[PDB]
Design a protein around this ligand. Structure first.
Ligand SMILES: CC(C)n1nc(-c2ccc(NC(=O)Nc3cccc(C(F)(F)F)c3)cc2)c2c(N)ncnc21
Length: 249
C-alpha cells in the first residue's frame, strides 16, 4: 500500500498523550516534516485513508508491521477540551466559539456526504491548530451518546448529530462536563424521560434551540450537518444580528 513508509523515516521526539492502547508523539518525518505519531502495544485505516477534508485530521503515513505507527498532521493546540479549560478559555467568546462549532459541523458534513458515522464525537476528540482551526479526529461516553445508540446500538450520523448538540454545550461552558451532578445511570433515565440540558448561562436561546433540535427523541427529526454548518456559518447575520459581547460569552 502507498501509505506505507519505513519506520526509519520517523523520529519520535516529544511525548503528547497516553491512552488505553498506545501513546501519541510529536515527531519528525523525513527530517523536514513535523508530525503527530500514534502508537500501539491497521484496521484503524480501512477508512482513515479514504477520508480527506480540511476539517478532518489528515493521515500522512503508516507503519503496519508491529509496532504499528501512524503519522498524521500536527495540531499545535491539542484537544479542544484541554484548549477550552486552558488559559485560552477565558478569552474565547461566542463568535470564536460559534466559528469553531461551524468548522466541526463542516467536517461532520463531509462525513455525512460520505455516508460515514463517527460514533464518538465530542470536544476530547477535536483537535485545535493555529488561528483557532478545529478538526474532527480519531473515531462508555454515555453523556455524549444518543439514546438509540446507547440502548440499542443504533449508531448513525443522526446519533452523531446528537453528540454535536452535546458538544455545543462544551463550547458554551468552556469545557464543563455535561449533565453536572449526574451519573451515567440517572442520565439515561432522565434523558429517556425527556429531560434535556437547559440553556447555558449567557448562551443565546437561539443557540439552545439548535441544541434541542439535535437532541430530538426521533433520530430522523434531527437536522443534518449540512444544515448545522450553514446555520452556524450564518449565525451572527441571520439569527443573532443583535449579539452583544458578555462577561463570558
Ligand atoms: C492531543 C494529542 C494526543 N494529539 N493526538 C493527536 C492525534 C493523533 C492521531 C489521531 N488518530 C486519529 O484521528 N485516528 C482516526 C481514526 C479514524 C477516523 C479518524 C477521522 F477521520 F475521523 F479523523 C481519525 C488522533 C489524534 C494529535 C495530532 N494529530 N496533533 C497534535 N496533538 C495530537
Amino acid at each position: 500500500d502507498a501509505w506505507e513508509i519505513p519506520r526509519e523515516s520517523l523520529r519520535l521526539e516529544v511525548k503528547l498523550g497516553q491512552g488505553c492502547f498506545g501513546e501519541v508523539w510529536m515527531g519528525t518525518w523525513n527530517g523536514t516534516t513535523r508530525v503527530a505519531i500514534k502508537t500501539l502495544k491497521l484496521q484503524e485505516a480501512q477508512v482513515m485513508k479514504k477520508i480527506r477534508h480540511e476539517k478532518l485530521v489528515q493521515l500522512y503515513a503508516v507503519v503496519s508491521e508491529e509496532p504499528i505507527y501512524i503519522v498524521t498532521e500536527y495540531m499545535s493546540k491539542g484537544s479542544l477540551l484541554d484548549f477550552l479549560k486552558g488559559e485560552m478559555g477565558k478569552y474565547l467568546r461566542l463568535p470564536q466559539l460559534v466559528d469553531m462549532a461551524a468548522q466541526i459541523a463542516s467536517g461532520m458534513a463531509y462525513v455525512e456526504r460520505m455516508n460515514y458515522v463517527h460514533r464518538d464525537l465530542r470536544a476530547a476528540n477535536i483537535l485545535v491548530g493555529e488561528n483557532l482551526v478545529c478538526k474532527v479526529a480519531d473515531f462508555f461516553p454515555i453523556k455524549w451518546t444518543a439514546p438509540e445508540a446507547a440502548l440499542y446500538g443504533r449508531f448513525t450520523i443522526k446519533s452523531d448529530v446528537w453528540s454535536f448538540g452535546i458538544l455545543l454545550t462544551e463550547l458554551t461552558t468552556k469545557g464543563r462536563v455535561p449533565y453536572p451532578g449526574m451519573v451515567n445511570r440517572e442520565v439515561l433515565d432522565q434523558v429517556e424521560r425527556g429531560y434535556r440540558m437547559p440553556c447555558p448561562p449567557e448562551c443565546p436561546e437561539s443557540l439552545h434551540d439548535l441544541m434541542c433540535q439535535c437532541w430530538r427523541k426521533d433520530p430522523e427529526e434531527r437536522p443534518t450537518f449540512e444544515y448545522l454548518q450553514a446555520f452556524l456559518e450564518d449565525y451572527f447575520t441571520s439569527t443573532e444580528p443583535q449579539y452583544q459581547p458578555g462577561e463570558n460569552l
